[PDB]
Every structure is written in structure tokens, then in C-alpha cells.
């Protein structure tokens, strides 16, 4: 072994683990790619670095000169943040003021310059403020995770290979929750090049299943269901779109912790749920499905993912 030059060399190479008791009834086999083990708990630690790095290399940005700007009340904020911190880049993040406190404490801790927007305008308002800021900023540079090719390209260079080599090339299906689409599109493309028979299953909210003809709407599965088809997503690579409800995902996420000792985010419950359904299809007996667990569940303690246990925790008094 060796010592990392810096935190950025710690990104990727996340572990693969088999789902045991939650996968009851499966004739197929399900392995989870724990992106929750990234330096900052999520898969965005990958694109956070990639998008920055790709700009540097293309000479588009210089530390302490360029001002990174990006609208996101999600994991991309953190990914970029910790990476900007290590590399010495000023980062500005926009997000609806709605987004709970805890989610700001973290970006601030990294020296992020936070700009909250009208909570009623959602991400649409955040995006505006971001471009408005871009216009105002001399050396401003917006990353645009849904447009930026460095997003899927990193998954094609790391995530995909990692899975291929980690499963021994035996992977039959790749289950991925679709947010920007960078993961399913990048990693998917690679796996497909290794084995054309590798099926890619995209996962979206039954409440906002737009890739299935559905109309966009609100759901609770943070991390996915953008309510629109991202530029980086390559729908042609998707072999099947599986839909999961917020409730399913939440129940699964909860089973993953209780039965597997895996404290995952709700979107992980989504992929886990889908992956398992697929693994239960008789024709898939013997097949290896790798589902991606995008984030660790501890960052979502305030969210609905823990409403039950949370109310229980507050309602409990001490025993003498």
C-alpha cells in the first residue's frame, strides 16, 4: 500500500457486498456497490472531482482564480465542496432556503459560499440565482452536472471498471437509480463494451416515472426523479426502467439497516428494491445483479426516511 497525496486520491474504488436476508426469495444474486463509502458518503464525490479536474486539465479553470458555481441542494454540493476545499477553489452553491439546516452546516464547514433561494421556486429558483451569479462573476464557472460530460465519463473510467473487475466479469445486470444519469450512462456503457449481454436497469420514482411515459411529479426518493431527461443520460443504453415508490424504497432502506447492518439513503432502498425484484424473476436464476447504493443513510436523519424511529426517539424518556 501507499499514502494518498490528498483526499481526492481517496475517491472511488468503493466495495461490493452481497445482500443476504433482504434478498429472501431471490433466485438471482444481488451485490451492492457501496458508494456510501466514498470519502464524503456519496457517489457524487466522484463527479465532484471529475468535473473540477476536467476543467483544470482543459485549462478552463485555475485554483484561487476561478469561482466554481453550481445549483444543488443534493450530494453534488458536498462532492464539489470537499474537492474544491482540497484543491483551493472558491465554491458557490445555490439551493432553496427550504433545504434543512444540517445540509448547510456541512457545505459551510468546507468553506462553501452558500446562497439560498426562494423555497417556493425550488431548484428552478436556485438555477436562476446560479446563472445570475455566473453573469456577475468575472472568473465564474458553472459545472452543470446534468450537462457536463465529465459526469458520466468518470463512471465510465472508474465506477464501471471497478464493477466489472469486482464481480469477476460475471455481472448480468446493473441496477442504477437515475438522478443525472451519469452513473448508469457512464458505467453502463463500459460494462456493455465488456459484455453486450449485460442488461442495464434504470430506476425512477413511480411518482415521477417520466422515462416510462409518466408525467413528472413530487416524490421523496432524494437523489433521483429529476422530473426531466438529463442531457448526460443516454436512454438508448437502458435495457429496462424499473419503478419504485417512495414507500417501497423507505421500507427497503429500513430493512437494509435492520437485517443487513447497512444504513443506506432512501435512493439506495430504491435500487435495492428494484434489484431484488429483478433477482426474483425466475428466468434470472443464477444471475448477478449489482445495484448502486449512492449514499449513506446518516446524512438523512431529518428526512422522512427516519420519521418512525425519529418520533420514537424523541418520545422516549429516561429509566431510573
Amino acid at each position: 500500500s501507499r499514502i494518498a497525496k490528498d483526499v481526492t486520491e481517496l475517491i472511488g474504488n468503493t466495495p461490493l457486498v452481497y445482500l443476504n436476508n433482504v434478498a429472501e426469495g431471490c433466485v438471482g444474486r444481488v451485490a451492492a456497490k457501496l458508494e456510501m463509502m466514498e470519502p464524503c458518503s456519496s457517489v457524487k464525490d466522484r463527479i465532484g472531482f471529475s468535473m473540477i479536474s476536467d476543467a483544470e486539465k482543459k485549462g478552463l479553470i485555475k485554483p484561487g482564480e476561478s469561482v466554481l458555481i453550481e445549483p444543488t441542494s443534493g450530494n453534488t454540493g458536498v462532492g464539489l465542496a470537499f474537492t474544491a476545499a482540497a484543491k483551493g477553489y472558491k465554491l458557490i452553491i445555490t439551493m432553496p432556503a427550504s433545504m434543512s439546516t444540517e445540509r448547510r452546516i456541512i457545505l459551510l464547514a468546507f468553506g462553501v459560499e452558500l446562497v439560498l433561494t426562494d423555497p417556493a421556486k425550488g431548484m428552478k429558483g436556485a438555477i436562476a440565482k446560479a446563472e445570475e451569479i455566473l453573469a456577475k462573476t468575472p472568473n465564474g464557472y458553472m459545472l452543470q452536472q446534468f450537462e457536463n460530460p465529465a459526469n458520466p465519463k468518470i463512471h465510465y473510467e472508474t465506477t464501471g471498471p471497478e464493477i466489472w473487475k469486482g464481480t469477476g466479469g460475471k455481472i448480468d445486470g446493473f441496477v442504477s437509480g437515475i438522478g443525472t444519469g451519469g452513473t448508469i450512462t457512464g458505467a453502463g456503457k463500459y460494462l456493455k463494451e465488456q459484455n453486450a449481454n449485460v442488461k442495464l436497469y434504470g430506476v425512477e420514482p413511480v411518482e415521477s416515472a417520466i422515462l416510462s411515459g409518466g408525467k413528472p411529479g413530487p416524490h421523496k426518493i432524494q437523489g433521483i426523479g429529476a422530473g426531466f431527461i438529463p442531457s448526460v443520460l443516454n436512454v438508448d443504453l437502458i435495457d429496462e426502467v424499473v419503478q419504485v415508490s417512495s414507500d417501497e424504497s423507505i421500507d427497503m432502506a429500513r430493512q437494509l439497516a435492520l437485517k443487513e447492518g447497512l444504513l443506506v439513503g432512501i435512493s439506495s432502498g430504491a435500487a435495492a428494491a428494484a434489484a431484488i425484484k429483478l433477482a426474483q424473476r425466475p428466468e434470472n436464476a443464477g444471475k448477478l445483479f449489482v445495484a448502486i447504493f449512492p449514499s449513506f443513510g446518516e446524512r438523512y436523519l431529518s428526512t422522512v426516511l427516519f420519521d418512525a424511529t425519529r418520533k420514537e426517539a424523541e418520545a422516549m424518556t429516561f429509566e431510573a
Binding site: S98, M123, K124, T180, G223, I224, G227
Partner: peptide
């Protein structure tokens, strides 16, 4: 109000 409150 078109729901655009996603967390990505």
C-alpha cells in the same frame, strides 16, 4: 408551481 424540489 411545477415541482422542481429534487435533491441531486
Amino acid at each position: 408551481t411545477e415541482w422542481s424540489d429534487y435533491v441531486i
